[PDB]
Amino acid sequence: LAFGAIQLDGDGNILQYNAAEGDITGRDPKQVIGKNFFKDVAPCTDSPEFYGKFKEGVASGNLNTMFEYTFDYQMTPTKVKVHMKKALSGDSYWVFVKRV
Numbered sequence: 063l064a065f066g067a068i069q070l071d072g073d074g075n076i077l078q079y080n081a082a083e084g085d086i087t088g089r090d091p092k093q094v095i096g097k098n099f100f101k102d103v104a105p106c107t108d109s110p111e112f113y114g115k116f117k118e119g120v121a122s123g124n125l126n127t128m129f130e131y132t133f134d135y136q137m138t139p140t141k142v143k144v145h146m147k148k149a150l151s152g153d154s155y156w157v158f159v160k161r162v
């Protein structure tokens with residue numbers, strides 16, 4: 063995956079996104095990575111339950127699953143498949159998204 067592969071820490075901050083290796087856009091780069099999630103009391107960012115039991119993933123100590131989620135609604139995103147993996151570094155977990 064040259065796109066879809068993001069690595070985040072098991073505390074709540076994004077570390078690196080695997081895709082940025084060629085700045086061929088003039089976007090505002092405050093979209094992804096460098097994300098320190100402060101307790102602004104915002105549990106509604108399209109994910110009431112974080113990813114795939116991400117909240118349990120952390121404390122269970124084995125956040126590594128591939129789960130495909132189909133959106134059979136109207137105003138929903140495309141069918142994606144999340145492969146999360148507890149980073150081999152330790153207290154961090156990856157997120158590989160892959161649309162079908």
Ligand SMILES: *C(=O)/C=C\c1ccc(O)cc1
Binds near residue numbers: 105106
């Ligand atoms: C999170 O924001 C959950 C519910 C909700 C309901 C109504 C409005 O306007 C915002 C949010």
